[PDB]
Amino acid sequence: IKKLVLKNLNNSNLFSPVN
Amino acid sequence: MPASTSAAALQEALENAGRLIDRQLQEDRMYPDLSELLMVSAPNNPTVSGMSDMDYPLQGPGLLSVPNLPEISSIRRVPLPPELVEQFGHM
């Protein structure tokens, strides 16, 4: 999709293993 | 500056360049006779080579290699003239 949305309020942590 | 000291420094620099060319031209002119490439020290002391992977270095990773490097050009085919291709039926 071409329409960007910022949503910093909920991100997966890049710099971590998964739970 | 007095022009004599810049002229002297340029004349020394042109020899210091020329005396490096005398090095490299003597190094290329130190190419061996095939007798020393083949490691033969006398005609009555005959020798062998072609017995190690270092005689014919393989293009393998971690050797002195460019992989896929060509030694010959792409072979351009040219046919026999048709006016001879007929005559091969007559032999």
Binding site: - | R76, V85, F88, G89
Partner: protein, 96 residues
């Protein structure tokens, strides 16, 4: 012979138009496989799918003197291929 060279885009276009004249004259001679042996090396056209965008990116950097020639260079190269095809379907298996 005198060691003269010019503005790169004009200098390259001059020699590419000259070697295109050898491509066209060796096509008009009927020697055809010669014109293949030239266009392989001029690289004005792709000959494998691998090189199509190599040529489309190069085409945006060619001069308009080269752009005007490309349609008849394509028809000459296609008639060279189409004539080598006719030659192969003519080399009957009772002698080849």
């Amino acid at each position: 012979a005198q060691g003269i060279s010019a503005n790169k885009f004009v200098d390259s276009t001059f020699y590419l138009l000259l070697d295109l004249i050898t491509f066209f004259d060796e096509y008009h001679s009927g020697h055809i496989d010669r014109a293949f042996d030239i266009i392989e090396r001029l690289k004005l056209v792709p000959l494998n799918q691998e090189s199509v965008e190599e040529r489309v990116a190069a085409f945006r950097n060619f001069s308009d003197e080269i752009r005007h020639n490309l349609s008849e260079v394509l028809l000459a190269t296609m008639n060279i291929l189409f004539t080598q095809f006719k030659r192969l379907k003519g080399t009957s298996p009772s002698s080849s």
